[PDB]
């Protein structure tokens, strides 16, 4: 029939998509980020200490790390020569440090307690930010600079979402000047009880391959006390057209755009002429989902690739901090969208695997049992969320694995796999601890897991029986 045309077009589209995904997911750049991370994250803060960035504990540990492993990993010795981190990775410009803090007096205390305590600082919020000079007010490290003046944006850290403003300092190109600047910052105390977040940003090039790398390290100081570190190493490609494979990838991208336009036109024409319902098929909703995701990806790529003005601005003055955070954010978004799109395109292959009596009856069984599976899955998920909310309310303050609701869901999903530690859950509560685990495992593996099998087996049996009886009695 006409399925041959659709199969050929879909195969060509899949080949183009696979070529594009193989091109974007290049050769081993895993080792690039691996070496960078192990250089900066796994290195102990000092020759005598055993703590690294991943296991920071207090603010003094942060100060030891700043004038320490960071300076060792940033400047490599080989008029004011530049720094090659592995004798290949070139440090672009200078790194930048930034601080976000709240103001004293953003915090209300009971009137009967205003005798022994005077100072309390609220949690981070845009309304309670501090926008006043402090300490020896000389430069940009003691003066508030707006988000617009810093060309910054939000971050969405772990505790909260942080603004793009704060008190910032641009370091130097040599180690001695940066060490002097950090010592001056530390001597005139810069991280007091009012601070709430600290960012460190820089970038490298690694001219051997054509792949920039952007590094951002964040440290959060919650109001309750402690230190929470996080990191981000992101590789980008901003000088794409260099080799022949780049031109091949560009041609493939143009072909992909043509394919997407053809699919959009076909979808519009085939929904407009007739079939006004069009949505009781599940093979037309998947098509529009794929089209929407691909159009979003194309728009993101078009809007991102044209905003390379930061590279041009940096290349004409190489003594300033280059702003590459927006490009990294949009690259991450594009990667997520492309991954989801390719997953759905691969899923779309089920429409064409019907070529013998064996493969047709399996599809018929799945389509017939989908309704019952959904009906039972509603109840299964209701019971699952009841377990999750009970665990969150009971163990959510002592176990480090039930601290958030989604973490409770993931913890139960891991309990199903058996990847859990029973020792921690029982010591949080001697009673109701073993009861929770026991009843969860029992009612999950003995009851809920078997109803799915019952439904699937009954549907498959009835489908095969009726098909065989009507086929053999014709």
């Amino acid at each position: 029939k006409s399925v041959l045309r659709e199969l050929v077009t879909y195969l060509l589209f899949l080949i183009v998509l696979c070529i594009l995904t193989y091109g974007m997911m290049s050769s081993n750049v895993y080792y690039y980020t691996r070496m960078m991370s192990q250089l900066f994250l796994d290195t102990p803060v000092s020759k005598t200490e055993k703590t690294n960035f991943k296991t920071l504990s207090s603010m003094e540990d942060f100060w030891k790390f700043t004038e320490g492993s960071l300076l060792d990993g940033l400047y490599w010795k080989m008029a004011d020569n530049r720094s090659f981190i592995f004798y290949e990775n070139l440090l672009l410009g200078v790194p930048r440090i930034r601080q976000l803090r709240v103001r004293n007096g953003s915090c209300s205390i009971p009137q009967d307690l205003r005798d022994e305590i005077k100072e309390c600082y609220d949690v981070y919020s845009v309304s309670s930010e501090d926008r006043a000079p402090f300490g020896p007010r000389n430069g940009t490290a003691w003066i508030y600079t707006s988000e617009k003046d810093l060309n910054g944006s939000s971050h969405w850290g772990i505790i909260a979402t942080y603004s793009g403003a704060g008190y910032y300092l641009d370091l130097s190109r040599t180690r001695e000047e940066t060490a002097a600047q950090v010592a001056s910052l530390k001597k005139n105390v810069w991280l007091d009880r009012g601070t709430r977040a600290t960012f460190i940003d820089f970038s490298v090039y690694n001219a051997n391959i054509n792949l920039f790398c952007v590094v951002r390290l964040l440290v959060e100081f919650p109001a309750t006390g402690g230190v929470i570190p996080s990191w981000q190493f992101q590789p980008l490609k901003l000088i794409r057209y260099v080799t022949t494979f780049d031109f091949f990838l560009a041609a493939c991208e143009i072909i992909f755009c043509f394919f997407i336009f053809y699919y959009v036109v076909e979808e519009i024409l085939e929904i407009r002429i007739h079939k006004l319902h069009y949505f009781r098929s599940f093979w037309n909703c998947l098509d529009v989902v794929i089209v929407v995701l691909s159009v979003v990806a194309i728009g993101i790529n078009i809007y991102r690739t044209s905003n390379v003005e930061v590279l041009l601005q940096f290349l004409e003055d190489q003594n300033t901090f280059p702003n590459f955070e927006h490009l990294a954010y949009w690259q991450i978004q594009f990667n997520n969208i492309a991954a989801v799109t390719v997953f759905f395109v691969w899923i779309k292959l089920f429409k064409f695997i019907n070529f013998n009596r064996t493969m047709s009856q399996l599809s018929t069984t799945m389509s017939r049992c989908a309704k019952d599976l959904f009906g039972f899955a509603i109840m299964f998920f209701i019971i699952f969320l009841a377990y999750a909310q009970l665990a969150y309310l009971v163990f959510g303050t002592q176990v480090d694995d039930f601290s958030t609701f989604q973490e409770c869901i993931f913890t139960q999903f891991r309990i199903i796999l058996g990847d859990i530690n029973f020792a921690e859950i029982e010591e949080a509560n001697r009673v109701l601890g073993p009861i929770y685990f026991t009843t969860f495992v029992f009612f999950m593996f003995f009851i809920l897991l078997n109803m799915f099998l019952a439904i699937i087996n009954d549907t498959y049996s009835e489908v095969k029986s009726d098909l065989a009886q009507q086929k053999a009695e014709m």
Binding site: F422, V441, F442, F446, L449, N450
Partner: protein, 97 residues
């Protein structure tokens, strides 16, 4: 239908879970009379064909004054699952459905 079957297969499920309780108690008795022989070498077959419930993948052995009720229930219930003893419930439920 679903809940109906769950309330129609209750006696058979209770009999199966009674059998499972007996089997789990037997295993827990067997699995702690030879891990108490911790020292440094338990056996060959008993070291490989043995199940400990999730957590402490490498056994610390020697349950000195720590063989509480909760770990016994944990290990018995998890050993009951690994061996596929709980899947027997399907054998009932399917028929009822």
């Amino acid at each position: 239908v679903f809940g109906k079957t769950l309330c129609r297969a209750l006696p058979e499920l209770l009999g199966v879970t009674l059998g499972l309780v007996v089997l789990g108690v037997a295993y827990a008795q067997l699995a702690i009379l030879l891990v108490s022989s911790c020292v440094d070498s338990l056996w060959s077959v008993a070291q490989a064909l043995l199940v400990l419930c999730p957590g402490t993948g490498l056994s610390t052995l020697c349950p000195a004054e720590s063989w509480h009720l909760s770990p016994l229930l944990c290990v018995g219930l998890w050993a009951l699952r690994l061996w596929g003893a709980l899947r027997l419930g399907a054998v009932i439920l399917r028929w009822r459905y």
